[PDB]
Structure 1
Amino acid sequence: DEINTAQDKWHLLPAFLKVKGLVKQHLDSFNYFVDTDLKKIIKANQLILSDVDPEFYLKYVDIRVGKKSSSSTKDYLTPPHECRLRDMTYSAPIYVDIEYTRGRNIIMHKDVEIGRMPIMLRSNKCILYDADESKMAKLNECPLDPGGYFIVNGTEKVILVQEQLSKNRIIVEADEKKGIVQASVTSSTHERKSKTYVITKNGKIYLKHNSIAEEIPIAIVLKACGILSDLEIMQLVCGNDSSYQDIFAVNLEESSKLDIYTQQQALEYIGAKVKTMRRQKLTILQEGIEAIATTVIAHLTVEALDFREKALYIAMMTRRVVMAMYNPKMIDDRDYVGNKRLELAGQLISLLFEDLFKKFNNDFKLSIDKVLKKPNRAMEYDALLSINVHSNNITSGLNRAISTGNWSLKRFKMERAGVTHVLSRLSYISALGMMTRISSQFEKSRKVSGPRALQPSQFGMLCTADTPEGEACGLVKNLALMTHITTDDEEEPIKKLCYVLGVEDITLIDSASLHLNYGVYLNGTLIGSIRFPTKFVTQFRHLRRTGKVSEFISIYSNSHQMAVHIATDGGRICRPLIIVSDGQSRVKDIHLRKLLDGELDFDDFLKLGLVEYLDVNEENDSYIALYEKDIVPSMTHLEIEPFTILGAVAGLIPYPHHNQSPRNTYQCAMGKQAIGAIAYNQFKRIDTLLYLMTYPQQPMVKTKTIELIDYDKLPAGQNATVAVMSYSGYDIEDALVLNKSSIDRGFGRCETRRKTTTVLKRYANHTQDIIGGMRVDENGDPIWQHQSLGPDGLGEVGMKVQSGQIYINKSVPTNSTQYREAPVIYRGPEPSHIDQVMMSVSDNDQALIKVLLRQNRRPELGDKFSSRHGQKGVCGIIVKQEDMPFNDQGIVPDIIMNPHGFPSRMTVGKMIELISGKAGVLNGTLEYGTCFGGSKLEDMSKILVDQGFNYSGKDMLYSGITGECLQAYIFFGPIYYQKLKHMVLDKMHARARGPRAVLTRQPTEGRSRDGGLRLGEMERDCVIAYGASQLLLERLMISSDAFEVDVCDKCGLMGYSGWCTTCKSAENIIKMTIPYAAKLLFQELLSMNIAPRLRLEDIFQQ
């Protein structure tokens, strides 16, 4: 049956994901790091030298990760799951070759190790790279695990994708009330990162820099940058425009208002304010400081007697400020996805490694100095011992940064946290959506919803539904399904190609005609003007399509600002689109036939110029068609598949285009919390917490994304027979009615698995902990606390452990001979079972114990369920099967969903899912609820009628309690339901009296520490508004912290034991009750010398 390209073009998406997976940002970045950036760091810090002994140079000639040149095969790595079990870092050694000179004129190589690099899972260096599920089984790895994260100390850490503003790009931003216009560029070079503002103050444009002490008049800076004619300054920042010249004439005149100027004079004016350089090279404080003042003023390094590039950069920035002054709305939008760059795990680790390597080299040079600083006996033999002992700092720094997420980089001088997060293992989709997560840049002024807003420019780049609730809402964003993050491409050959294509260099042109033709930019930097900009852009795109230039290079022509921009940097988000030429799509189904045949993979669609990547800025010039059936000749591109605008997690929702959007976002939140299957090795894992469904079912109505991301292989939920009807009155406000005997048969059954880790650590006095125990009573019978312990003192595998029983019998030395008991007690409301006890050693030689406790859970009142449409709700009643309504065949619902949850939430996709799933089970087929598609409702109705059911899914039911026909037909069929991790068994908490804080004497704050429930200021306001004074006293003072203090009636100072201890009398000591917090406040005030003296009076005596 012949290929119909209007429907088979979606196969480009599976072909794309077959070679560029969902976790590809991480894998590609780590591969690029360990394959080029390590070499680049080594080349940068190639030689480390000492002041003394010029007959000594230590060279860094080659670096490698995980492989020596002694053996062709790679080094043996401990498998990642073994690292997870033993709480080790999954790492590979960092091998370098060294040229260090011997005293007797000897030059030699070596292959030495300078630490361990943590290896991202499924990277080039990972043992899991190219394993075929048999190697995966042998290694105890799930083949469906995404990879893309690290195992440091047994913990799965993902370095989340970070979203920042584009570096080295100008952002114009106006203001109101203040009436300033501020254009800023963040110049992030390799060695420095500085911001160069161009402010407006009192109608005059100024330049502001962190290094410069004062804001400088702009015409002074333009003269200092070789543009001194004072007429071309006007021709550079205004051109021929009466308004702009009028705006800028003030600054033109203020150039002279100080004095008339030459270039060197303006340079001197610049140099008089450059603050300092930590008092080194002090002999340069002259006109010769302007040079580094101007070469530090931006990211454009000028290394000669020409300032054309920097001068025109400043002039263009000033022109932008002037255009914003004349016409607001000519400012850049900081929340536009074209202005954002995504930095990745590879770049992060590259910066971290370069800094740790610099610290390593500094310390190594100092150690070399110490070794060679002796008069005699200074043999060069084994200069590498200090490298055998100082190599651990690289390993330690990498491990610490990945483990804590704190990145102390001194060179760039910033301390950022939250870089890495623990890989959430709540569900398979939870891990997958943890990957493809993007954290937005801090200091966003979170008081506003500017960045929190969903941008139209994120279409097909970031998931439209996968954003969190709570505080983070738009601050966390997720990658869309079919995207790509560009890589840094070299701008030098591209600039040469631009010159070849008709761009006259920026030095051959005059100022008068500069704003007469389009100017060609390159990463924001003007490199010349172009005649026929559209022809230039077209030829550049032809070169990109034919493979002459890189496909991640984007060109776009801006018409308001007459410019042709070319971007080559990494961190741009882009997606493939089918090129439309002459009103025709270029795929035309012969390529689709070849693609389905197996040859002609996705990258062939680029190597033949049938598809191309567009970043956000190129879409500003494109004209994209959603479907081939609506291509017009004016269009430029065709969508490969419009549902790719949703990410991986939102791809679980069936018919998301029939729902109100907040419900889709809520499902994005709930699916990550769905209990289901975790991995094929989920029983070999020993994890801190793991919720597993006993009988997972795959959804009756899946989507294309579900099978793309393999959620149908590890599903989280069950297909509940659902009747949408009001019932029993325990299903009001989202509460659910659950069928007992569906629960009895295993519906909604799940287990909790929790891990407890102990270390039998070693001590300075040659002592260690022990697991001795299992003591008995007189009969020889084990005592109750050791009932399920076993001879070794580690809870037996298979046995039930109840609250109070010991499952690890850890004895600690009393003088770390004698052993104080520190047993591990099970403190659980409900009994657990011991299913795994793992005995092992950690990397540092000492025993490691892990005991996994499993707890089977049966659904109860207050357990939380959700239906992929944001309709969550607790179980409100569990009724017997006979009380449930039944149809003609005796089918009873497993769940009853109240009908009042539909009219306001407007989740029509849930109804369509019910009908599609019903027709699907009757027909024997799984149906599809793919976004902007899926199984058609009328075809499902045809199946329902052909099977004997009503087309609308409404069966006539009988009441279970009366037996009569219900007077309404009931919407009745299968719906996919998820049991969420939130189970009332883990939430129920009750405190009468327990631990109190040592400081405040108030009940603890932790549900685990038997804490009390805070009665806050708003509850206090409510109780005051009731006028319940005695209740106020009881709740706040008497039942939180009541202290019977002794108060002196002469000095208002609290004493003790009826002793004023300032009057030393015991005469005037009154006894009264005050909050211990008040007593604490008085004692703290007395500390600061403040004397809050209490004045008393008799309660009675009228």
Structure 2
Amino acid sequence: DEINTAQDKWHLLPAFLKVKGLVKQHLDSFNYFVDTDLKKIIKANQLILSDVDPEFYLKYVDIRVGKKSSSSTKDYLTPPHECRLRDMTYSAPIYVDIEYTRGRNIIMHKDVEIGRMPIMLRSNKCILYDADESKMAKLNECPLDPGGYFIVNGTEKVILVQEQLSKNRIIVEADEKKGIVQASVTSSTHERKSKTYVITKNGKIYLKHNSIAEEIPIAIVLKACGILSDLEIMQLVCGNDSSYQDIFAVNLEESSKLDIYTQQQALEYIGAKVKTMRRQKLTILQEGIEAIATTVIAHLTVEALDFREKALYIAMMTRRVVMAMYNPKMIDDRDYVGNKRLELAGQLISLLFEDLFKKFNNDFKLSIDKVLKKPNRAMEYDALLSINVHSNNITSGLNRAISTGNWSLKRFKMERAGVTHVLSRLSYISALGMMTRISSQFEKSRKVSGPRALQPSQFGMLCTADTPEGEACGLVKNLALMTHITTDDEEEPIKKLCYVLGVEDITLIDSASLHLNYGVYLNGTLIGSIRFPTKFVTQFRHLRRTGKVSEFISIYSNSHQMAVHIATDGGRICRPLIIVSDGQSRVKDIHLRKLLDGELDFDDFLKLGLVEYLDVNEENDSYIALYEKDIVPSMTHLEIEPFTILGAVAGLIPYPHHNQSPRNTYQCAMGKQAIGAIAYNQFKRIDTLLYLMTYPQQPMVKTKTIELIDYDKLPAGQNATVAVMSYSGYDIEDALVLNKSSIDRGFGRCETRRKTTTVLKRYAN
């Protein structure tokens, strides 16, 4: 039969899922961690030095997980099922190369293990990578098992995907009877802080930093950041609009109210308010302290004497404030999906390992100082017995953080709980749904229902029915079926490309013409302005479709806020979409014929420019068709399959569009509690609790989802002969009538297996 694009474009979903499984956020994040972020930590903390014995150093040259240079193979890892059975941690050793100086001018390498790295299941370092169900049989592992969790002390722990507001981005919010505050939570690789920004009174605009004693008025900081003309201030923050001028003039007047200002007068004013630095470098208490204050006021770290970038950033901050004060509804929804980011297991473990490695290096330097403080016979030979003994701390911390879920990061200074949860083994669907589960940010003031409502902007990105009941109702969310999470890619080669494509740098731009053209933002920062914003957007999109820039960069244009926005950061949620050009789809069923024939795996639809990822923000600029039949020649994309708006669990529902939505939500709840088949190795497993159906049947009415997630291979239920009638009076209020002699013949017959573990502990005596 000839391929019909309308009803065969759905095969792009199985094509996408073959190479990008449902448990892929965790997988890719952990692979990225262990492959590049470990090198990044070891290259940040590359050398440790001592005050004494200057002719001596320790160098961290290389870092590796699970492999040595002695043999081509990796080390033997006790398989994850054996780790589960023996209540140990599925971990691979971290090997480093050490350059420690010998007293007789000798230079050597080494392969020294500094701890065990808890390895995520089915990652690159995991032994179950690319196994053919035969090695899985030999390893007593289920081929259908999701992977993407950790076995620490024999318990399956999953680092849930974390929801949080996007960092390094301006958010503006109003309020009633209090004023307008709008922050920019800026996070560096070593210091996180939020540059708060509120209107105290009289329409006066202030900058409120934690390190600053009192909120510095806005004209003062604007004059401090090089913009000291006090007309270009009003030009940058006000443009040519008449209302904003009088809205803003009060804090212009205040600038002269105190004393007329040069740049350095404002800089001294800022510096007078810096709190403290734990009484180190006391000789910096001068006008120069404001330089560090402004350097550590945001992410726009300045390493020179030009303050234009930070000045324009603060001017946009102010102008958004002024827009909000002129009229509300210029604020951003804090629950808009475009304003959130998803931290993943790899990023979490990256920061945790960075903290643990800093502790390890501090303690190693302490031990080295204690050893080498001795006057005589300072033999250098075998100076690594300490690190051989001292390797236990990295492993202990790395295991315990995952085991307990509490992550005590001294450097970044917060205590978070519930980062990990025990992977649920009630059902195969329960485990798979604990994967692809998102936990929202706490300290949210649960008394209100902003981040509890379902948003129209989560269409196709977060499942529209898989939201749990009772207390965390709307706080825990689930990923949709056909979704990707962007990864952090370098921003510097895209700024150059933007300059090539006609964007003129802000340092080339004057204040009086800034709000007359569209301004191009890179990750929320005004890098410049451009004529022809729509042409720039089209050329950028053409470059991305031709693969000249990463497919995950998002470009969209805001008309109310005259801006072309380009986003490159990781954590943005995106989904693939068929590109509709000139009123026609780009797939045209020859690509579909190739795809079912075997050629053109899903990646090639991206290399060919037929399919592109859209995040929530680009969906503002897009116009998607649900079906090929209603493609009007003004639409920009076409849905691959609209049933992907439901997650894995909600795909168990037959005909969900014929139900009231609460019924779909409740089935999303109960399907994870359904009793059935767990895994192909369920009788080899020994779990704290396990419910198994004796005679599980696959549903007679299934969906595409349940066969895309192999639910028909381990089903949880049975096809009961049902008569819908009133009977016996014992069926009122949800009560059921069960056939005796169906129960006799095995209908509904299940069993429970419970484990009891004891250890014959040896004692001191």
When normalised by structure 2's length, the TM-score is 0.99
Once the two structures are superposed, residues 248-303 of structure 1 have per-residue CA deviations (whole angstroms, 9 ceiling, x without a partner) of: 00010000000110000000000000001000000010001010111111110011
Indicate the residue corresponding to 1:68 in structure 2.
68
- Give the Cα–Cα distance (whole angstroms) in 1 for the partners of residues 335 and 677 of structure 2: 38
1:92/1:199 CA distance change after superposition, 3 Å: farther
**Match of 1:759, SS?**
coil
Q: What is the alpha-carbon distance in structure 2 between the residues aligned to residue 25 and residue 389 of structure 1?
A: 35
> Contact between 1:162 and 1:342, CA under 8 Å: does it hold in 2?
yes
1:325 alignment partner in structure 2: 325
> CA shift at 1:181, angstroms?
3.9
| SS in structure 1 of the partner of residue 172 of structure 2 | strand
Determine if contact 1:424/1:431 at 8 Å carries over to the other structure.
yes
- Whether contact under 8 Å (2:623, 2:634) holds in the other structure is yes
Q: Does the CA contact (< 8 Å) of 2:185 and 2:193 recur in 1? A: no
Taking the aligned partners of 1:188 and 1:20, their CA distance within structure 2 comes to: 31
* SS of 2:73 mapped into structure 1: coil
| Per-residue deviation, residues 600-629 of structure 1 (Å, max 9, x unmatched) | 000000000000000000001100000000
C-alpha spacing 1:63/1:189, structure 2 compared with 1 (3 Å) = closer
- Shift of residue 200 of structure 1? 4.4
For residues 189 and 205 of structure 1, what CA distance do their matches in structure 2 show?
Answer: 30
2:226 and 2:308 in contact (8 A); partners too:
yes
1:264 partner SS: helix
- SS across alignment from 1:362: helix
User: Whole-Å Cα distance in 1 between the matches of residues 146 and 545 of structure 2?
Assistant: 32
Residue aligning to 1:736: 736
Whether the aligned pair in 2 keeps the contact of 1:237 and 1:318 (CA below 8 Å) is: yes
Give yes or no for contact 1:68–1:111 (8 Å, CA) kept in 2: yes
> Per-residue CA shift, 1:1044-1092, capped at 9, x if unaligned?
xxxxxxxxxxxxxxxxxxxxxxxxxxxxxxxxxxxxxxxxxxxxxxxxx
Match of 2:240 in 1: 240
Structure 2 residues without counterparts, runs of 5 or longer: none
- Indicate if the aligned counterparts of 2:170 and 2:182 stay in contact, CA closer than 8 A: no
1:756-784, CA deviations, whole angstroms, 9 ceiling, x for partnerless residues?
00000000xxxxxxxxxxxxxxxxxxxxx
Per-residue Cα deviation, 1:556-578 (whole angstroms, up to 9, x for no partner): 00000000000000000000000
CA contact (8 A) 2:184 2:194 kept: no
Shift of 1:198: 4.4
Tell me how far apart the structure 2 counterparts of residues 165 and 731 of structure 1 sit (CA, whole Å): 48
Q: Do the aligned partners of 1:225 and 1:263 also contact (CA within 8 Å) in 2?
A: yes
Kindly state the Cα deviation for residue 197 of structure 1 after the two structures are TM-superposed.
2.8
How far is 1:195 from its partner?
Answer: 3.6
Q: Residue 629 of structure 1: SS of its match in structure 2?
A: coil
8 A Cα contact 2:520 2:565, kept in partner = yes
Q: SS at 2:401's partner residue?
A: helix
CA contact (8 A) 1:84 1:155 kept: yes
- Judging changes above 3 Å, is the alpha-carbon distance between structure 1 residues 200 and 555 closer, same or farther for their aligned structure 2 residues? farther
CA contact (8 A) 2:255 2:261 kept: yes
Deviation at 1:39, TM superposition (A): 0.2
Does the 8 A contact of 1:495 with 1:522 survive in 2? yes
Q: CA deviation at 1:362?
A: 0.2
Is 1:35 paired with 2:35? Answer: yes
Shift of 1:188: 4.1
Deviations, residues 1010-1042 of structure 1 (Å, cap 9, x unaligned): xxxxxxxxxxxxxxxxxxxxxxxxxxxxxxxxx
Q: 1:57 to 1:530 in 2, by over 3 A?
A: same
Indicate if the aligned counterparts of 1:653 and 1:664 stay in contact, CA closer than 8 A: yes
CA distance in 2, matches of 1:440, 1:287: 42
Deviation at 1:201, TM superposition (A): 3.1
CA contact (8 A) 2:77 2:127 kept: yes
Flag the 1:63–1:181 CA change in 2: closer, same or farther, 3 A.
closer
C-alpha distance after superposition, 1:623-676 (max 9, x if no partner): 000000000011000000000000000000000000000000000000000000
8 Å CA contact 1:579, 1:610 repeated in 2 = yes
Following superposition, the deviation at residue 177 of structure 1 comes to 1.8
Distance in 1 between residues matched to 2:718 and 2:535, nearest whole Å: 58
- 1:189 positional shift: 4.0
Check the 8 A contact 1:189/1:299 in 2, yes or no. Answer: no
SS in 2 for 1:99: strand
CA contact (8 A) 1:160 1:439 kept: yes
Tell me, in whole angstroms, the C-alpha distance in 2 between the residues paired with 1:336 and 1:190.
Answer: 28
On the 8 A contact 2:180/2:324 being kept in 1, the answer is no
CA contact (8 A) 2:505 2:528 kept: yes
Counterparts of 2:86 and 2:199 in 1: how far apart (Å)? 57
Task: String of CA shifts for 1:678-713, please: whole Å, max 9, x gaps.
Answer: 000000000000000000000000000000000000
Report deviation, 1:240: 0.4
Contact 2:164–2:341 (8 Å) recurs in 1:
yes
Q: 1:109 offset after TM fit, Å?
A: 0.4
Shift of residue 312, structure 1, vs aligned partner = 0.3
Q: Which residue of 2 aligns with 1:587?
A: 587
Do the aligned residues in 2 keep the contact of 1:168 with 1:187 (CA within 8 Å)? yes
Report the CA distance shift for 1:704/1:685 in structure 2 as closer, same or farther (over 3 A): same
Q: Percent of aligned pairs with the same residue?
A: 100
**Is 2:181–2:196's contact at 8 Å kept on the other side of the alignment?**
no
Determine helix, strand or coil for the equivalent of 2:309. helix
What secondary structure sits across from 1:124 in the alignment?
Answer: coil
Kept after mapping to 2: 8 A contact 1:186/1:196: no
| Secondary structure, counterpart of 2:178 in structure 1 | coil
Deviation at 1:190, TM superposition (A): 3.7
SS state at 2:751 partner = strand
Contact map agreement 2:181 2:197 (CA 8 A) in 1: no
Distance in 2 of aligned mates of 1:193 and 1:387: 35
Verify the 8 A CA contact 2:545 2:606 in the aligned structure 1.
yes
Q: Deviations over 1:474-503 (max 9, x none)?
A: 100000000000000111000000000000
Q: Distance in 2 between matches of 1:377 and 1:719?
A: 81
> Per the alignment, do residues 192 and 451 of structure 1 end up closer, same or farther by CA in structure 2, a change over 3 Å counting?
closer
Q: Is the 8 A contact 1:198 1:318 kept in 2?
A: no
Deviates more, 1:263-272 or 1:197-206: 197-206
Whether contact under 8 Å (1:184, 1:198) holds in the other structure is no
SS in 2 for 1:534: helix
| Contact 1:167-1:188 at 8 Å conserved across structures | no
What do the CA deviations read for 1:6-30 (whole angstroms, capped 9, x no partner)? 0000000000000000000000000
1:308-365 Cα shifts (integer Å, max 9, x gaps): 0000000000000000000100001100000000000000000000000000000000
1:192 is displaced (CA, Å) by 3.5
Q: What secondary structure is seen at the aligned counterpart in 2 of 1:579?
A: strand
* CA distance in 2 between partners of 1:641 and 1:311 (Å): 46
Distance 1:29 1:146 in 2: 15
Distance 1:181 1:195, change over 3 A: closer
Q: Is the 8 A contact 2:179 2:198 kept in 1?
A: no
CA distance in 2, matches of 1:251, 1:548: 46
| Aligned-pair CA distance for 1:383 | 1.1
Match of 1:691 in 2: 691
Aligned to 1:515, the other structure's residue is in SS state: helix
Secondary structure, counterpart of 1:254 in structure 2: helix
User: Offset of 1:196 from its aligned partner?
Assistant: 3.7
Q: How does 1:130-279 map to 2 (within 5 A)?
A: 130-279=130-279
Higher relative contact order (CA 8 A, sep 6+): 2
Within 2, Cα distance between the matches of 1:382 and 1:513? 67
Tell whether the 8 Å contact from 2:179 to 2:199 is kept in structure 1 after alignment.
no
- Check whether the contact 1:183–1:320 (CA below 8 A) recurs between aligned residues: no
* TM alignment of 1:551-570, pairs within 5 A: 551-570=551-570
**Distance in 2 (alpha carbons) for counterparts of 1:272 and 1:286:** 8
Q: In structure 1, the residue corresponding to 2:163 is in which secondary structure? A: strand
Work out the CA distance in 2 between the residues paired with 1:341 and 1:284: 38
User: Could you list the runs of 5+ residues in structure 1 that have no partner in the other structure?
Assistant: 764-1101
Structure 2 Cα separation of the partners of residues 753 and 185 of structure 1: 49
* Secondary structure of 2:543's aligned partner: helix
Q: State the structure with more CA Rg.
A: 1
Count of residues paired in the alignment = 764
Residues 654, 701 of structure 1: 8 Å contact kept: yes
**Conserved 8 A contact 1:489-1:569:** yes
Report what 1:285 is aligned to.
285
Please say if residues 576 and 614 of structure 2, whose CA atoms lie closer than 8 Å, have aligned partners that are also in contact.
yes
Q: Secondary structure at the match of 1:757?
A: coil
CA shift digits 1:686-741 (9 cap, x unpaired): 00000000000000000000000000000000000000001000000000000000
> What is the distance in 1 between the residues matched to 2:449 and 2:204?
32
